[PDB]
DNA sequence: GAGAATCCCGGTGCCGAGGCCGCTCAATTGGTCGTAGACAGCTCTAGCACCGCTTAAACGCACGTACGCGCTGTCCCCCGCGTTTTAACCGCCAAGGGGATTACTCCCTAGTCTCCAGGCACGTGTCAGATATATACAT
DNA sequence: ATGTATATATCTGACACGTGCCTGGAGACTAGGGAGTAATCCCCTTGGCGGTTAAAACGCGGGGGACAGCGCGTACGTGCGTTTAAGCGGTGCTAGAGCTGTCTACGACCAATTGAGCGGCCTCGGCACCGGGATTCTC
């Protein structure tokens, strides 16, 4: 449906900047697997977040601190 | 002239080298709203939020690709295959 | 005069 | 001597409640002593935070309902909004 | 308003009354159902297609055209 | 006349509202918190004891040993996602041995 | 006063125990009172002012 | 010499108890040793020692699950230096 | 001798205890260096929990808040 | 007034080197390292005040703390600086 | 020895990164008191150390066989490249739905006096294991 | 000749109940400021235009890489002789853990004040972009 928009050459640019060599075709459907899965989780804590404070939008301030819900936090969005 | 590979080691190189996203907005924020859309109805979302997502999830590919580089430099193999990244999220703690 | 006091109430004890 | 704090009785009887006839030992009120005291101070901070973040200065229970909601994987979870919704009904009831 | 609320309850859903007594209304845009009583209640006697355009943009007024005038007679709904 | 009575509950409410007014997390307290932490607190322990009480007569001992909560705690995957960082002591290893790993 | 079904509008012979909503018969507790998602209850019995 | 049978009775025999590997005289000194790097004579306590113990072990014990999985991995029961690395490595550390 | 104080069968009984069924000689003194930087990580925070107390000993507190520091928390 | 730290690292930042510039974005980036450090370390300095009962906290404890989570060397050159600047407060 | 594919040197708007004034809250200074940290002093728990019997666990040498490893023939499936084509992205325009904040308000939670029974601490009885008799029967 | 079967008879051994007690949770009274609501302005983002364009989909030649298979040796498993220094357990000694008493000075609280960092506005040059020439692995 819309799973196929991180289509085959932009795993292969995530595989590069990772730093693979070659790839075969079965790792573009498991990296979008757990990319699904992992980007699944970090909006399962948005959803909790927003609805907590009544509000219906989802800034940078509610990922940042779910990624630091989660112990895998980034700076440039506040602290 | 025609080689078996080397422009992949100047593509690497050059990306190493360069700090840009690699992953295109468009499909990203679309599928995200596909996710929200599935989860609840008519939310709002914000542009820094939409590159903070981008930047998590390209950081977590570095560190799972990286990860999967390391487990198959072990294996003695170059190319890469799905035991080695499901054997990596087992190990880390991503699923069990 | 502690440890005499300890060993006479064991003593007393026992 | 020390007055010690520990719900070793209250997690011995409810044990007793739902089980009228199995036993226990001492090492396993030490043992969930520290499973309940751990998960207390992990909920609580967690509340704290959230609250802070929301920037709410007090703790009712809608911050604390909203990290179950939030915190463990599932299905306790599940079970346990309902149950504490419940409970806070009886109380108010009451 | 109904005459009888108490009897008018249980009879409404019968397939004598949905035939005569169910109003479907149109939203303007560009294992059998017959002993379910949630095909009745949702979707009256008429048979349900999900893949019509124009079956899902659809009302059905079966029960609540006798409730909604009760809550003046019984406050308590 | 207790609290913890009139809540309908078992696990103690004066006790959690104690340790949350010293314990320095809010400086303003409501009433209803303490008694969402009190149900569940008893809804977890109540949770787990029913686990550790089909352990028990799974190995037919009435004594709940902590290895009795191991094996509980490892049979369902909800409490091996919440309890799968933490280390006990006394616990063992739960018993998986590979199909490969087994002669022929 | 009358109990009624919340699902339906019927005449609500059974309350269930978990979420305290009064139903009809046996199906709409199977696929409507039981699969139902959280908070759907308290505009579910906003109608009745039951919450 | 019988090869296996033993070995399985072995794995078993240590996969059902819960006996405690590590004696508890040597570790003490070990761990009374790595504290006297910071405090030297530290009077030492019999619960801090068995939470050492128990410590070490729950370590040791996922470190070895993660170097025989990633050796059965590799398609080789028998255990390398550089699989306990590998493990260290993509473990955190 | 606090290297070789550690049995080489006790390690073989980890190693056990861990699923292993072929185990090399050269692995027992990586093992115990690994240990030796763990135990070592674990009581610096031990020991400092101790002059944290106003205390010339060690106790089971501290060493219960060492091992919740780093993310390996006791039970 | 809405808070931040900018003109204190630019000052900062016009001692150490007087001819180097940053970003709003680097900016930002280490707002929220600021930020961050200063919630690791102040609740740290709650709960080892919580550990012992302490319902005062004083320079030690938290002392103690920067030599519990930050690794040596660091930690050594962290507390010199930390000592001085305390008894160059007092000393006043 | 050639060739795509790099690195390097020079011009070009530009648009996003340094000053500056206005000024408004926020850090600074001073007085007061009531409590918690620190020091002194106190009683006993428990940690350290050494002696000696028991002995099951550990070292060490000997050998044997599967398993780690070295090499080999093979499909064959990914890799470079030409050709459509199809969605991405930039520039822009208007809406309107939602975020902030002002502004009173009231209630319920902070704080304090009292007091009694809930839970903690310390005794006594009451069903599970261990040796022993013992004598006739069956193997 | 010996196990044994099934009940003794003593007989300890680990575990759950019946009295003290003390202290903190609950009932009752006072206050004030923190959510509660809501209205209004403003701002940004969600749709919707359309060109055009780097880039994905698709198919095809080709080449090393992964697959099972077979032999060579050796390393860990197994075993028995010979230690050994772990374990129990026992006793003797004394540091130090822990509780109490008391003091007093750092620090919360309150009222007035001054000043400096936030921000809108203004101004200008560092870097990406583009164009063309040197240079380096690769065939």
């Given at each position: 449906?819309?799973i ?6 932009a795993?292969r640019?995530l ?6 060599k070659?790839?075969?075709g079965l ?20 959803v ?21 819900r ?10 | ?7 992949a080691?100047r593509?690497?190189?050059r ?6 996203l ?15 859309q ?14 903070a997502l ?26 890469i295959?799905?035991?080695?990244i ?11 | ?13 026992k | 001597?020390?007055?010690k ?23 396993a ?14 909920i ?6 959230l609250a802070?973040?929301n920037?709410?200065?007090?703790i009712?229970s ?7 909601r939030?915190?463990?994987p599932?299905?306790?979870?599940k079970?346990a909004?309902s149950?504490?919704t ?5 109380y108010?009831?009451? | ?11 409404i859903?019968?397939?004598?009354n949905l035939?005569?007594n ?18 009745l ?6 048979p ?5 355009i124009?079956?899902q ?5 079966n029960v ?14 | 006349?207790?609290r ?14 104690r ?22 607190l ?10 550790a ?22 049979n369902?995957?909800?409490?091996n996602?919440?309890?799968g960082?933490?280390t006990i ?12 790993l087994?002669?022929? | 006063?009358?109990?009624y079904?919340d ?6 012979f059974?309350?269930?125990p978990?979420?305290?909503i009064?139903?009809h018969?046996?199906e709409?507790?199977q ?14 019995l906003?109608?009745?002012g039951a919450?």
């Amino acid at each position: 449906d819309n799973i196929q928009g991180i289509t085959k050459p932009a795993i292969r640019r995530l595989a590069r900047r990772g730093g693979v060599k070659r790839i075969s075709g079965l790792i573009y459907e498991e990296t979008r697997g757990v990319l699904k899965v992992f980007l699944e989780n970090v909006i399962r804590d948005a959803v909790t977040y927003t609805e907590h404070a009544k509000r219906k939008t989802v800034t940078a301030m509610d990922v940042v601190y779910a990624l630091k819900r989660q112990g895998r936090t980034l700076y440039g969005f506040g602290g | 002239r025609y080689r078996p590979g080397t422009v992949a080691l100047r593509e690497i190189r050059r990306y190493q080298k360069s700090t840009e996203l690699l992953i295109r907005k468009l499909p990203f924020q679309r599928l995200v709203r596909e996710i929200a859309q599935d989860f609840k109805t008519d939310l709002r979302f914000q542009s820094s939020a939409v590159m903070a997502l981008q930047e998590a999830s390209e950081a977590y590919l570095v560190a799972l690709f990286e990860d999967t580089n390391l487990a198959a430099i072990h294996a003695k193999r170059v190319t890469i295959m799905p035991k080695d990244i499901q054997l990596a999220r087992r190990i880390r703690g991503e699923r069990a | 005069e502690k440890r005499l006091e300890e060993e006479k109430q064991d003593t007393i004890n026992k | 001597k020390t007055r010690k704090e520990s719900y070793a009785i209250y997690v011995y009887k409810v044990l007793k409640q739902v089980h009228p006839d199995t036993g226990i030992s001492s090492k396993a009120m030490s043992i969930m002593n520290s499973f309940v005291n751990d998960v207390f101070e992990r909920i609580a901070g967690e509340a704290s935070r959230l609250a802070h973040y929301n920037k709410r200065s007090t703790i009712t229970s809608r911050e604390i309902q909203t990290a179950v909601r939030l915190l463990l994987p599932g299905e306790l979870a599940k079970h346990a909004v309902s149950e504490g919704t419940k409970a806070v009904t009886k109380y108010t009831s009451a | 308003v109904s005459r009888n609320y108490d009897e008018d309850i249980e009879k409404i859903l019968t397939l004598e009354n949905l035939d005569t007594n169910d109003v479907v209304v149109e939203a303007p845009f560009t294992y059998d159902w017959r002993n379910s009583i949630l095909h009745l209640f949702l979707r009256g006697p008429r048979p349900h297609d999900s893949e019509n355009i124009h079956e899902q943009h659809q009302m059905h007024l079966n029960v609540e055209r006798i409730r909604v005038p009760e809550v003046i007679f019984q406050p308590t709904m | 006349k207790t609290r913890s009575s009139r809540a309908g509950l078992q696990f103690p409410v004066g006790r959690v509202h104690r340790l949350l007014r010293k314990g320095n997390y809010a400086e303003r307290v409501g009433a209803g918190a303490p008694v969402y932490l009190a149900a569940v607190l008893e809804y977890l322990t109540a949770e787990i004891l029913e686990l550790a009480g089909n352990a028990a007569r799974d190995n037919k001992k009435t004594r709940i040993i902590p290895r009795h909560l191991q094996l509980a705690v490892r049979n369902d995957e909800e409490l091996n996602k919440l309890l799968g960082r933490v280390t006990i002591a006394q616990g063992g290893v739960l018993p998986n041995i590979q199909s490969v790993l087994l002669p022929k | 006063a009358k109990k009624y079904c919340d699902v339906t509008g019927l005449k609500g012979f059974y309350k269930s125990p978990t979420n305290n909503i009064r139903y009809h018969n046996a199906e709409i507790y199977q696929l409507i009172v039981k699969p139902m998602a959280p908070g759907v209850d308290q505009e579910y019995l906003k109608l009745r002012g039951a919450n």
